[PDB]
Design a protein around this ligand. Structure first.
Ligand code: NI
Length: 164
């Protein structure tokens, strides 16, 4: 549906603009993002990964459309606990790394209709939310690695991207 930017790319390092209003054009990006995300078997996507520099996230932790989450202009209000899993990312294909995260987050955001909601999450949902928000600030999971590890990932994908 949309093309996923592959690390390294400058638009994966940008702090994105909030959505000014959630209208039809924004709902179309959201639906196009979900299509892209399911097609590549992701459980989260952020707009900058499809080269749209706005604060828009689509998440589906189960992958079956029965607990979708759209988070527009999201903000973590509070959090607690400590956790970490081996995260991957559609813009960083072929790699996973252990990222330290909050176990629990409270997040406010606008839904696909522009309505504000405030959500408590834990488990994999909370991890996905923190991951995807990182994207909106131009942060990738490789930024939590040592400079040399991140570099070696970058070199490998530079090559991959040519070979595609
Ligand atoms: Ni990601």
């Amino acid at each position: 549906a949309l093309n996923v930017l592959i690390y390294p790319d400058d638009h994966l390092k940008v702090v994105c603009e909030p959505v000014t209003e959630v209208n039809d054009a924004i709902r179309k990006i959201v639906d196009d993002m979900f299509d892209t995300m399911y097609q590549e078997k992701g459980i989260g996507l952020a707009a900058p990964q499809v080269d749209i520099l706005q604060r828009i996230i689509t998440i589906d932790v189960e992958g079956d459309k029965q607990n979708q989450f759209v988070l527009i202009n999201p903000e973590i209000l509070a959090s607690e606990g400590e956790t970490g899993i081996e995260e991957g990312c559609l813009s960083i294909p072929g790699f996973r790394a252990l990222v330290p995260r909050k176990e629990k987050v409270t997040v406010r955001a606008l839904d696909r209709d522009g309505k504000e909601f405030t959500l408590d999450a834990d488990g994999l949902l909370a991890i996905c939310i923190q991951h995807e928000i990182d994207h909106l600030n131009g942060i990738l999971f490789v930024d939590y690695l040592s400079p040399l590890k991140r570099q070696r990932i970058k070199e490998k994908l530079i090559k991959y991207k040519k070979q595609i």
